[PDB]
Amino acid sequence: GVAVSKVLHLEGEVNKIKSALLSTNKAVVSLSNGVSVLTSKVLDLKNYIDKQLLPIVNKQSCSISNIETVIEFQQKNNRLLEITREFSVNAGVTTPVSTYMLTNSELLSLINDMPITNDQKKLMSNNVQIVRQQSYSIMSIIKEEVLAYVVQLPLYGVIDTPCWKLHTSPLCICLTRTDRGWYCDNAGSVSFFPQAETCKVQSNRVFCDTMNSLTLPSEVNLCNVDIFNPKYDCKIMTSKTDVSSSVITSLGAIVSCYGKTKCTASNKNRGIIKTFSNGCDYVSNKGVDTVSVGNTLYYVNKQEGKSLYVKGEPIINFYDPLVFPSDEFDASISQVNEKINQSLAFIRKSDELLG
Amino acid sequence: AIASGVAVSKVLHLEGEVNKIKSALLSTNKAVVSLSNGVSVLTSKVLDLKNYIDKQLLPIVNKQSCSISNIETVIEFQQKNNRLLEITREFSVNAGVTTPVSTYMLTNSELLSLINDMPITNDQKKLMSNNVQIVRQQSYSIMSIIKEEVLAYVVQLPLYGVIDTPCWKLHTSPLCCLTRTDRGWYCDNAGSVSFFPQAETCKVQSNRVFCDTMNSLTLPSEVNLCNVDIFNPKYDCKIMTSKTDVSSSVITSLGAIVSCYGKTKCTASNKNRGIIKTFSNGCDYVSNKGVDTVSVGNTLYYVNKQEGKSLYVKGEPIINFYDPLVFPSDEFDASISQVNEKINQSLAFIRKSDELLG
Amino acid sequence: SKVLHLEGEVNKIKSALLSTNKAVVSLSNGVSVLTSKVLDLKNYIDKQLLPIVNKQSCSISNIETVIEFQQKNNRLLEITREFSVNAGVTTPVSTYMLTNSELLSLINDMPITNDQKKLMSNNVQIVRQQSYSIMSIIKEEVLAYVVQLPLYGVIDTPCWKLHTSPLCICLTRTDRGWYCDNAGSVSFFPQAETCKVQSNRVFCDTMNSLTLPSEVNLCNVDIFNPKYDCKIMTSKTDVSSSVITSLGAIVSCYGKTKCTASNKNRGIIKTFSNGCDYVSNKGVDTVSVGNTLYYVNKQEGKSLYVKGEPIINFYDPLVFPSDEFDASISQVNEKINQSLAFIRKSDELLG
Amino acid sequence: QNITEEFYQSTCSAVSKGYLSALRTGWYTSVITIELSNIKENKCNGTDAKVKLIKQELDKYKNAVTELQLLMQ
Amino acid sequence: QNITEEFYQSTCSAVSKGYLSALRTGWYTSVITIELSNIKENKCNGTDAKVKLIKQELDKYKNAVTELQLLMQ
Amino acid sequence: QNITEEFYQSTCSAVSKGYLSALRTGWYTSVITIELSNIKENKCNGTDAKVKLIKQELDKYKNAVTELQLLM
Ligand SMILES: *[C@@H]1O[C@H](CO)[C@@H](O)[C@H](O)[C@H]1NC(C)=O
Ligand SMILES: *[C@@H]1O[C@H](CO)[C@@H](O)[C@H](O)[C@H]1NC(C)=O
Ligand SMILES: *[C@@H]1O[C@H](CO)[C@@H](O)[C@H](O)[C@H]1NC(C)=O
Ligand SMILES: *[C@@H]1O[C@H](CO)[C@@H](O)[C@H](O)[C@H]1NC(C)=O
Ligand SMILES: *[C@@H]1O[C@H](CO)[C@@H](O)[C@H](O)[C@H]1NC(C)=O
Ligand SMILES: *[C@H]1O[C@H](CO)[C@@H](O)[C@H](O)[C@H]1NC(C)=O
């Protein structure tokens, strides 16, 4: 071939291959900056996490450590705080003994420890609502970390004795007995309990406090059959005029009718089922409900009425977790280390062409 | 080895360009290796940031989203069962029977709902609606059926037999020694007079007394003739006697009574005027208007209640604060769009390069 | 030979170039994908994580406010509770209603002796048990009630308690209760519910009390005493009982019934002839009358305990390994600062 | 003013006139029921696993009810 | 100590001597007023969109207050 | 139905018979001691620096305890 054309065409090359390389250089610089700006933003993200996000997440984690402990405080300390409250409200002493002051399992524990009979232990065990209404509770030592208080339980000196609850009305010059209340066969005598506050009554069981009781001899019962008795002086209230009033009892009622006063009985479904002559009559609660004496109505029977209801629907808690799409992320990082692995391939293939 | 004179200078020059262009491209390669190891370690890090967010910090944001759900519920349980939880408490505290009927056991809507359902007259229904405080203080509440998911108790209101009867209350003091002992509340039942002797069973509001007839005595209208004469022949007044001189005071609803007898020294002071009366031997009655004090010897009775220091407990409003976290996304989506403009224009340099080969 | 061999370089050196250019478009592609992934991770912290972290931040703030509500208003919320349960009037005056610092503050304002103030300021349990708290004005943002305390007209006067029993016709004195001296005479307190007693210090309300002459005390030595007409109860038949006094007990054994004064340590240590008797709680522990036992003393029982253990508040903070991370980002910057060194050299051999 | 006081030196006593009255002569009963707004335990973990607010708050309740179920007999 | 108990065969009664008295004869009345620390309800959004605790605590309160306001007449 | 009602006209008194009695004649005092499950606090910074719930719940308890100590 021509040999100046081989130099002028060869020169054509060396130039088209220099202007070539000068473009590839602006390409690696263009990219050195895109990586340098992407690099700073990866540092602004790691820094938004380390200096902004992470710190809040730590305080939120601390504020829930607080909240969850204030509640686990009042929950685990549920009993001690209910005691300190009702000692506060009652300024030291409380009656009756609550189920915070003393749980039931413990009460029974105590009952089985008192110096009493297996038949007295058995009684109290069955009437706890009553053994409690008759027990006190008394603060002794209270320090920050512990609270000790004495509990005071009753002890019965006698059990299984006949009791009777005496009611009375006028009798016409009029006469009214004024020794109403409870009577109990104490050893050899009758024990009488004037105030109806010192006697609790469960079913056919009666617990009484012999502290403000008078002791009477058994003759006091002859009174029931005759006011004027040679053996015992009955307690009476004399009036020199006619007087009428009802005395509703446990199982029924009494009705003293004397003079121009009109006393009738009635039924809820039947109406006036009776009228009273001037006399001392007794009406059972099985038959009669109310009892008009003059214009003042007496209700011989508790009157059932409107039932009320209050409904509460379950409350729903919603917890919707957060989940990062991590696998599709790692597959693109995998793809990016692919473009790097093979990016270095082509440069190695290139360096071998330069021997 | 060299052919002249076929431009020898131009051939020797190109032998130079090729040795420089060869070292040039060797260095160019070395840049693309560094930039590639650099992009390699950055990718690695952009990954450890995804693994910190996902394996470290997401476990904690979620543990929190659960803690906060548990909490919000335990509160909302103590909050929605607010009425129940109080009730079941005061049954625990009174062991199953509480008096009076608290505003937790029976609300006011419900109390009036129950009052219009009682078997009584428009006038009793109207009297109880206007003293709900007293009707409560006279009621009971007994727990009947307590199950885990529903509690049922029986409230117990009072029903009155008679209303708008005239009542009166007797205080008594020594007379020189006699001392009347039928002290207490009297009310008129049909025809007769009911006498409630314990101070416990009668509640007074305004001008209106509510008494329990459960343990009352029934007396003739002739006890009213006892206030005027103690030895009234139409009724035997129970009196309390003593063969010696006594002195005292007794504070009534609207004043007081001074039994001044013997060598004792009694007087009645007023807060502003001081002593306004010394007492001679006899039974005197002093108004709670004029007199605020009555002294009997060395003991001081108070005819009028004593106003005291007024106390205040001040409270300031609680201010809630939280911290919103806002991210600078716009400035960030720009420094990304510019990273992307660099790749677009870097690829254009390779495309210009290969457009030259050629 | 020359121009030929050189046209054979320009080929090899043109091949390594197409191989380099492909290496650059490889990286440029793998970096275009990294970039979008940093933008996808940013967009996660922004549109996803943040919105929950902010909702949680707010919810944490509602809870705090509610628990701080109950904590700051503790006292007022305890007060509206027992005004709700007791229906507007309460007794005693709780420590919520009046704090000890305030009760002493009031006891110093009251119109009384200094010996009174000091009595009341030592007996604050009794003083509260005798006071009422009455509700006067309740509004949404301020509840106002009235506290009502005892004012003691007299003090430091001698008191005594009277326990009685049958004496055998039988004679049982029915004047049991507390007596105190008053200016001149004596005051009697029948229903034992009016009298509060602490240590050796009686606190009696004189609303339902009975003014007696000083001679009601001779009744203790003689019933048929000619100075006072001793209130007495009569029975034409025989009776036997015991009444447990404060420092012992009285035992009335009469007729055929059998009484004895037992001991927890010794056993039955005495038997009772017909008559009135008195045993001290220093010597006897119980006292049988027929088939009914009376405990002269209180019976100390089994001690219960109820342990409890501490509650931690779990704190395990987050720590990000940033110093290592900032060193790697500084290394990526060192591979770029040097990559640019090489491209500057290459560009230098071409001018 | 309705209410007044009268004083008698003859008997040395004082009456307080002017009250209208209501004498309770019976009882009226009513049965009120109420239901539990029950919480369902949320199963999953919080910040501290050793802590079960929802569970404890129920056993706190259950046991109150139990302790009351033992007084009725 | 000071408290001694004396027995009397004649009347079959015992008498505790040694106590010192304090006879209530008047009332002292203070008017104690107590203010509320109130809670505004910050209005962002929480974890649970339904749960309105600040409003349910305020309304549980303004409710208790209305039952008492109704009690007095 | 052990409980029965008898009515008299000679005294005008009704009477409830058929109860069985227990009569208190002494007391039995047991001593109950209840420990506090105290909270051992790990102090830290929270959402709102002005709200320390652990601390305040305790100060509110410590104070209620103090008000009781002053009744003895
Ligand atoms: C990339 O190449 C390296 C070295 O040969 C190898 O360890 C790795 O498994 C390859 N895969 C990727 C894309 O990381
Ligand atoms: C990049 O190149 C493409 C094609 O011309 C274009 O769609 C895009 O807007 C350009 N910008 C960037 C930085 O992605
Ligand atoms: C949560 O923690 C508990 C206690 O370690 C464990 O029993 C349970 O498997 C864990 N996972 C979940 C989501 O309940
Ligand atoms: C967030 O709060 C505002 C104010 O309650 C409300 O209008 C908006 O709908 C809520 N939701 C979001 C995510 O903006
Ligand atoms: C974070 O809490 C610690 C520990 O209570 C405290 O010392 C510090 O002042 C608080 N702030 C920082 C950022 O340390
Ligand atoms: C890299 O280059 C920049 C610009 O010259 C310079 O500021 C920096 O100090 C150099 N070294 C590193 C690793 O930052």
Give C134-186 as a DSSP string.
EEEEE-SSEEEEEEEEEEEEEEEEEEEEEEE-----EEEE---EEEEE-SSSE
- Residue from A300, A170, A254 nearest B218 by CA: A170
Residue from A4, A243, A339, A346 whose CB has the most chain B CBs within 10 Å, to mutate: A243
Does residue A304 sit in helix, strand or coil? strand
Backbone φ and ψ for A45, nearest 5 degrees, come out as -85, -45
Cα–ligand 1 centroid distance for C20 (angstroms): 20
Other beta carbons within 10 Å of B109: 10
The whole-angstrom separation of Cα C193 and Cα A214 is: 17
**Å from C75 to nearest chain F CA?**
10
**Closest by CA position to C289, among listed A221, F27, A198, A158:** A158
Tokens found for residue A135: 């027990």
Q: CA B85 to CA C163: how far, in whole Å?
A: 46
- Chains A and D touch each other (3 or more Cβ pairs < 8 A): yes
User: Structure tokens of D72?
Assistant: 């009725």
Q: Are B278 and B297 in contact (CB under 8 A)?
A: no
How far is C3 from B11, CA to CA, in rounded Å? 7
Q: Per DSSP, what are the bridge partners of residue D24?
A: B160, B212
Instruction: Name, in order, each residue with C-beta under 8 angstroms of B326's C-beta and a sequence gap of 6 or more.
Output: C50
Strands A290-293 and A296-299, sheet pairing: antiparallel
Nearest to B161 among D2, D25, D46 (CB): D25
Q: What is the secondary structure of A156-205 as a DSSP string?
A: EEEEEEEEEEE---EE--EEEE---EEEEEETTEEEEE-STTSEEEETTE
Residue in the block written with tokens 């910040």: D47
C66 in B contact zone (CB under 8 Å): yes
Write out the two tokens for A312: 């509460």
Q: Report the interhelical angle of D53-69 vs A54-76 (nearest 10°).
A: 10
Contact list, A50 vs chain C (CB under 8 Å): 320, 322
Task: Give the best residue of C41, C58, C60 to mutate against chain A (max A CB count within 10 A).
Answer: C60
Which pairing describes strands C311-312 and F39-40: parallel, antiparallel, or unpaired?
Answer: parallel
The CA distance from D16 to the nearest CA of chain A, in Å, is: 23
Determine the residue type at B291. Answer: V
Handedness of CA C150, C154, C160, C164 (dihedral sign): negative
Residue type, D41: E
Strand order in the sheet with C259-260: C259-260, C287-289, C292-294
CB atoms under 10 Å from CB of A341, counted, come to: 13
List Cβ neighbours of D1 (8 Å cut-off, separation of 6 or more): none
Other beta carbons within 10 angstroms of residue C346's beta carbon come to: 24
List residues of F whose CB lies inside 8 A of any C CB: 23, 25-42, 44, 47-48, 51, 53-54, 56-57, 60, 64, 67-68, 70-72
For residue A34, what is the enclosing H or E element? helix A21-48
Q: How would you label C320-342 residue by residue, b for 16+ Cβ within 10 Å and e otherwise?
A: bebeebeebbeebbebbeebbeb
Write the CA distances from A36 to A318, B40, B293, B333, C250, integer angstroms.
45, 13, 96, 16, 105
> Burial, D43: exposed, middle or buried (Cβ in 10 Å; 0-12, 13-18, 19+)?
exposed
The first and second tokens of residue C259, run together, are: 């009484």
**Chain A closest CA to F44's CA: distance in Å?**
7
A17 to B14: CB separation less than 8 angstroms, yes or no: no
Distance CA C320, CA A151 (A): 57
| Residue in E22, A2, A217, B89 with CA at minimum distance from that of residue C236 | A217
Whether B313 and chain A come into contact, CB under 8 Å, resolves to no
Buried b (16+ CB within 10 A) or exposed e, B179-197: bbebbbbbbbbbbbbbbbe
Chain B positions in Cβ-Cβ contact with residue C174 (cut-off 8 Å): none
The DSSP call for residue C271 is B
Which among E14, E48, E62 is the nearest to C140, CB-wise? E62
> CA A76 to CA A72: how far, in whole Å?
6
How many Å apart are CA C165 and CA A141, to the nearest integer?
37
CA distance E39 to C69: 7
- Expressed in Å, this structure's resolution amounts to 2.8
> B28 — contact with chain C (CB < 8 Å)?
yes
Q: Which residues contact C337 (CB under 8 A, 6 or more apart)?
A: none
Structure token digits, residue C137: 């004005």
State the distance between the two ends of chain A, measured CA to CA, in whole angstroms.
29
Chain B interface test: which of C332, C340, C344 (most B C-beta within 10 Å): C332
Of C12, C129, C165, give the one whose Cα is nearest residue F71: C129
Interface of A with B in 180-239 (CB under 8 A): 180, 196, 237-239
Which of D42, D43, D44, D45 to probe ligand 3 with, by most ligand atoms within 8 A of CB? D45
Return the residue in B78, B155, B349 with the most chain A beta carbons within 10 A, the one to mutate for interface testing. Answer: B349
Name the 3-class secondary structure at A144: coil
Ligand with an atom nearest the CA of residue B345: 2
Regarding beta strands E13-35 and B311-313, do their DSSP bridges make them parallel or antiparallel, or are they unpaired? parallel
What is the dihedral angle through the alpha carbons of A2, A7, A10, A14, rounded to the nearest 10 degrees?
-170
Q: How many CB atoms lie within 10 A of CB D6?
A: 12
Q: What share of chain A is helix, strand, coil (3-state, %, to 5)?
A: 40, 30, 35
Conformational region of residue D44, where left means phi above 0, alpha means psi within -120 to 50, and beta covers everything else: left
Nearest CA to ligand 4 atom 14: E45
Q: At C288, is the secondary structure helix, strand, or coil? A: strand
What whole-number distance in Å separates Cα of residue C86 and Cα of residue C65? 29
Q: Using the structure block, give the residue that is written with the tokens 């109390």.
A: B111
Q: Closest Cα to residue C185, out of C212, C159, C166?
A: C212
Residue of C331, C332, C336, C337 best suited for mutating to test ligand 6, as the one with most atoms within 8 Å of CB: C337
To test the ligand 1 pocket, which listed residue (A332, A341, A346) has its Cβ within 8 A of the most ligand atoms? A341
C-beta atoms of D42 and A299 within 8 A: no
- Residue among C293, D26, B185 nearest A158 (CA): C293
Instruction: Work out which ligand 1 atom sits closest to the CA atom of A337.
Output: 13
To test the ligand 1 pocket, which listed residue (A334, A337, A340, A344) has its Cβ within 8 A of the most ligand atoms? A337
- In single-letter form, the type of residue at position A263 comes to C
Phi, psi (deg, nearest 5) at residue E56:
-85, -20
Residue type present at position E40:
K
Beta strands at C132-138 and C89-90: parallel, antiparallel or unpaired: antiparallel
Q: How far is CA A113 from CA B48, C300, F29, in A?
A: 68, 10, 11
Ligand 3 centre distance from Cα of residue C250 (Å): 69
**Looking at this protein, which amino acid is placed at residue A276?**
F
Exposed e or buried b per residue across E14-45, where buried means at least 16 C-beta atoms within 10 angstroms of its C-beta: bbbeebbbbbbbbbbbbbbebbbbbbeeeeee
Q: How far is CA A183 from CA A226, C224, C255, F20, in A?
A: 18, 30, 21, 11
Going from N- to C-terminal start, the domains of chain D cover 1-73
CB F23, CB A208: distance < 8 Å: yes
Structure-token match 């349910």, residue found: E56
Q: Which two structure tokens, joined as six digits, stand for A174?
A: 């009029």
Quote the distance between the C-alpha of residue C237 and its chain's center.
Answer: 56
Q: Which of A305, A218, A216, A292 is nearest to A257 (CA)?
A: A292
Judged by a CB distance cut-off of 8 A, whether residue C57 touches chain A is yes
CB pairs under 8 A between A and B: 286
Interval between CA A338 and ligand 2 midpoint (Å): 22
Residue E73 beta carbon below 6 angstroms from any ligand 4 atom: no
Start-to-end C-alpha separation, chain F: 50
The chain B residue lying nearest C185, using CA atoms, is: B246
Nearest to A135 by CA among B11, B195, F26, C204: F26
Helix (H) or strand (E) holding B184: strand B184-187
Amino acid at B176: C
Chosen for mutation from C314, C316, C318 (greatest number of chain D CBs closer than 10 Å) is: C314
Query: How much distance in Å is there from the Cα of B82 to the middle of ligand 5?
Result: 38
Query: What is the DSSP annotation of B97-127?
Result: EESS--TTTS-HHHHHHHHTTSS--HHHHHH
**Method of structure determination:** X-ray
Q: Chain centroid to CA A14: how far?
A: 96
CA distance B33 to A338: 15
The pairing of beta strand F14-35 with beta strand C311-312: unpaired
Reference A302, options D24, E2, B103; nearest CA is D24
Identify which of B92, B144, B93, B100 has the alpha carbon closest to the alpha carbon of residue D33. Answer: B144
- Residue with the smallest CA separation from ligand 3 atom 12 is D44
E45 lines ligand 4 (CB under 6 A): yes
Taking CA atoms, A229 is separated from A222, A234, B334, in Å, by 7, 8, 116
Please enumerate in sequence order all residues whose Cβ is within 8 A of that of A197, keeping only pairs 6 or more positions apart, or say none. none
Contact C239, C254 (CB under 8 A): yes
In the block, tokens 């209910």 appear at: A82
Nearest-CA distance C246 → chain F (Å): 12
Tell me whether residues A247 and F3 touch, CB distance under 8 A.
no
B-to-C residue pairs, Cβ atoms closer than 8 angstroms: 286
**Exposure string for A18-27, b = 16+ CB within 10 A, e = fewer:** bebbbbbbbb
* Alpha carbon B340 to chain centroid, angstroms: 62
DSSP, collapsed to helix, strand or coil, labels residue A301 as: coil
What's the residue count for chain A? Answer: 355
- Segments in chain B forming alpha helices (H): 8-52, 58-80, 82-94, 108-115, 122-128, 132-137, 329-354
Element (H, E) at A130: helix A128-133
Contact call for D and F: 3+ CB–CB distances under 8 Å: no
Q: List the chains bordering chain F where 3 or more Cβ pairs fall under 8 Å.
A: A, B, C
Query: Which ligand is in closest contact with the Cα of B338?
Result: 2
CA angle at E26 for the pair E20 and E31, rounded to the nearest 5°:
120
For A14, which of B14, B113, B190 is closest by C-beta distance?
B14
**Cβ neighbours, 10 Å, residue B2:** 9
The ligand whose atoms approach the alpha carbon of A348 most closely is 1
Q: 3-state class of C292 per DSSP?
A: strand
Domain extents in chain B = 1-358
> How far does residue B337's CA lie from ligand 2's centre (Å)?
9
CA nearest A95: which of A156, A151, A157, A148?
Answer: A151
- Asked whether D34 and B83 are in contact (CB, 8 A), the reply is yes
Residue A274 phi, psi (nearest 5): -165, 155
Neighbours of chain A (3+ CB pairs under 8 A): B, C, D, E, F
